[model samples]
Target chain A: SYTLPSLPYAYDALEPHFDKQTMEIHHTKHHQTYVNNANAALESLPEFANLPVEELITKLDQLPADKKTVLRNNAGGHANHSLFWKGLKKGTTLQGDLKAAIERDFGSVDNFKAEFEKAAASRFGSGWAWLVLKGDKLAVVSTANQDSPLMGEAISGASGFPIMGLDVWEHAYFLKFQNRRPDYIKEFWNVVNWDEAAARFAAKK
Target chain B: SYTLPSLPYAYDALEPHFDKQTMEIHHTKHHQTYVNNANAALESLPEFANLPVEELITKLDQLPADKKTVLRNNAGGHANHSLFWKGLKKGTTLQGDLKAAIERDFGSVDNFKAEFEKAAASRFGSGWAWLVLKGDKLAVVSTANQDSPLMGEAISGASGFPIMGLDVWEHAYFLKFQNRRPDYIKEFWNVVNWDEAAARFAAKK
Candidate 1:
């Protein structure tokens, strides 16, 4: 059965940047629900039950029309949250290949942050802001609801190798930030796992 | 120059069923934002500024691409929430012609409730559930994000004479209901303004 993965660090690891209570509930409750719901949807689709989360999400259209929505949402949820957890660390510094790539693609690191923040802030509803690598170029994009880059550019309008993603769903920050999503997004920069991002870039590039 | 409309009743009018804090923020903050943004979009498009909400929404394609998204979302939000505010009241009962209409359309009022509840519950993210009149027949329909029936049947997939609408946006009930959307939706029946609904039905029918 698919299960919620343990956070690499304690819930409070991100401290003031990311509140402890939100972290606890987001991981324990939100992420767990996605996993449980994904498994529940997979139960009747035995052929898909053992497929990797990414594979299942990318191939969502292949599932029965009745089952497609559930698989896309829950499977996308499970896959996205897994990356969300790994993409955060208490302290992170961007350097080397990924940093150079960002500079080359986006002019400067500051420009990338501005574009990323714009993507995160301008997302009007529940969704995500992403830094995705399309070949050697990086772009900032956003998708609504539980949609993911893996869903392909046609469906999600944000396809590529997603090395960095920031969850802009209200559930991600509503408890602590309320309607001040900008403040929450600004705080997110402090907790990014650039090491993980660089490794993904290296592997994919 | 659009502005937040005064609530016909006190903030606590839908209390217990729909908590006071949620109502205050929903009306003063959430609805106000939509009005302000709608006004902002209208200022640049003087040619369409005088059009009614429904007309503006249905004619979204007429707007420039740069202005279309903002106008559609904000205008739709303003129109939808305006209806949302007027659609509720305390201690109301359904009867007369509208009652018969509900029965005629769906076998009985119980069947209509089941169908309406299913539509509201099944809507995935931020949206509204509607009971709209198509000529003399009634149907339950829903729209995503800030979309509304006024956007026309093709664009919204639920357009008609909107007799009753239930806003399922997280901001509408999240403060009181949190993740228990089913419970929030269950409480919605208690606040429905049958008189307003009946008037809408009679006018449309």
Candidate 2:
């Protein structure tokens, strides 16, 4: 059974950028519900029972036809939130290979930020915005609901190894940002964990 | 050009159920943006400019392909919010032809509530759950993002004249209900305007 991963930092660690209460509720309530639902769906399907949440979502199409929708939504939710929590932190800088890669792929760091923010802000509803490694290059993409870039193009419409992601779901920001999503998007840059993102970028296959 | 319709009740009128601040922002910010975006998208499409928001969505497939996405999202947003605001009231009760219709279609009023709550709660992300008139029957359906029952099955997957709708978007209840979407769905029944719903049902072709 998939278990909810503890946040790498305290709930208040990302404060001011992502508030304490929202973070706590998002992880404990929203993400835990996803974990519970995913586990329940997987309990009857032994073929997927032992796979990691990441693998479960990436191989979503291979799951039992009757249980596909519940597994896709819940498993996808679990995987996405796990990565989202890891990708957030305060006072990180952009540098090294990841920095060079951004300049190479998107012209400059500012261009990369612009593209990422646009992807985050323009996502009309509940979803996530990701900075991902697509082949040898980096790209910004958005997916609806709990869908992840790892789900592959056939399911998520955008597939890549996600280096970093921002949860654009209202649960992610409503307490602090409300309907001003663009404001929330702007503040997200202040807490991005570029070191963790760099490690993901470096480890991409 | 489309405009944000005034809420049928004061923002605080449904207080303790829908809350005041969330209602105000949902109306003045979220719905207003949809109206603005819908009008912007309609500017270049002179043929669609004068059409009612409802017509724009129902005839969505006929619009220029280049403008289809923006129009579908924003025009659908405009139309759905307009209906949603009118469908909310604090003290209205279920009765009359609409009451009988619910009993005939879903076994009883309680069955209708159960079905509607299920549709609303099970909607995985941003969307609306509706009680709609499909042909001569009443049905419960949910549509993603700003999609409406009027958009036809080809576009929205469920077509009908919407009698009542519950916005399941997190922004609709996040401030007051947070991650407890089921709780939000439960409270929604307390504010449903059965009179307006009956009027829509009576007018349906």
Candidate 3:
């Protein structure tokens, strides 16, 4: 059975911007649900248990139809939320090739931020906005629900390696910023771990 | 311009089960945003101004591809949330023809609630679980994000006239229930307007 991981930092580390209560609950309650549900869902499929979460998502279309939706929701929830936590940190810098790549693909860092926020904002319901590497280029894409970009194209509707993502799910922010997602999205910049994002980007590239 | 209509009952009427804060924000803020967004989405299409919202949804495929998603999401939101507000009334009783219909469709009222709540809970993310009439038959179905069954068979992928629905969107219950959606689903039966549901079921029948 999978266990819920402790937050890399104290829950209140991203305070004011992300909120202490929201952080604690999001990590303990929301992320925990994903971990427990995913473990329960995969318990019957012992052959698939040892498979990495990323590998399972990558091969989702190959799984039996009856078992697809359950794992897609639970497994994607775990994978997506795990990545979501890593993308959030109190302070981190974006520099070197990561900054250069953003300028190259999006014209400028400012343009990239605008495009990223637009993808995050235009998403009508619960979802995540991602900055992913498609080949050597950077692209902003969004997926609904617990859907992850890691899911094979047949299931996720899009496919790429997400280096950075922002969860726009209401449970992620409603406690501190109710019905004001733009405010939450704006504050996201202050807490994003660009250094971690760059590490993922470099490896994927 | 579409306007946010006042709720039929006081904000606190649903009280302890639905909670005053959630009801107030859902109506005044969430529902209002949908109405405003839907109106703005259609403002440029003068020929569509006199058309009913229901008519617009049914013919979504006929509109410009660029314009379809915005109207589908916002218009569906406006229509669905309007029904949601009307469906909520404290101490509703299910009896007579509606009671008979439930028995015919699902064997018993208990079975119907069991099936309905299952759909509400199983829906992976933000969406609605509906009891709709297709021909003379009753069915429990669901739609993602702000999609409505009224969108006909094209964009909505389902054809039915929804008579009663439960909003399982996180914003609908997150403030009060937090992560315990099962608790929220159980409490929903206490406030659903069976009279209004019967009226709708009769009209469609």
Candidate 2: deviation at residue A129, Å?
1.1
Clashing pairs in 3: none
What ranking of all candidate models by TM-score puts the best one first? 3, 2, 1
Each candidate's DockQ: 0.47, 0.78, 0.82
| Top candidate by lDDT | 2
* After superposition, candidate 3 runs with Cα above 4 Å error: none
Candidate 2, position A143, lDDT: 94
Clashes of 2: 0
Error at B137, model 2, angstroms: 1.1
DockQ of model 1, rounded to 2 decimals? 0.47
Model 2: fraction of the reference interface contacts it also forms:
0.80
Candidate 2 local lDDT, B63-150, one digit each (tens) = 8889988988999999999998999997888888889989999999999899999999888888999998888899999999999989
Weakest 10 consecutive residues of candidate 3 chain B by summed lDDT: B48-57
Model 1 chain A scores worst on lDDT over the 10 consecutive residues at A170-179
Residue-level lDDT of model 3, residues B101-171, one tens digit each, is: 88999999999999999989988888999998898888888888888888876666667998889999999
State residue B169's C-alpha deviation in candidate 1, in Å: 1.5
Residue B93 displacement in candidate 1 (angstroms): 0.9
lDDT of 1 by residue, B140-173 (tens): 9999888887788777777787998999987776
Interface root-mean-square deviation of model 1 in angstroms is 1.6
Candidate 2 per-residue lDDT, tens place, A1-205, comes to: 8898989999999877889998899999999999999888888888898899898887877877888889878998999999888888897999999999999999999999999999998887889999999998899999988888898997888988999999998888888877778899898898989999999988983
TM-score of each prediction: 0.95, 0.96, 0.97
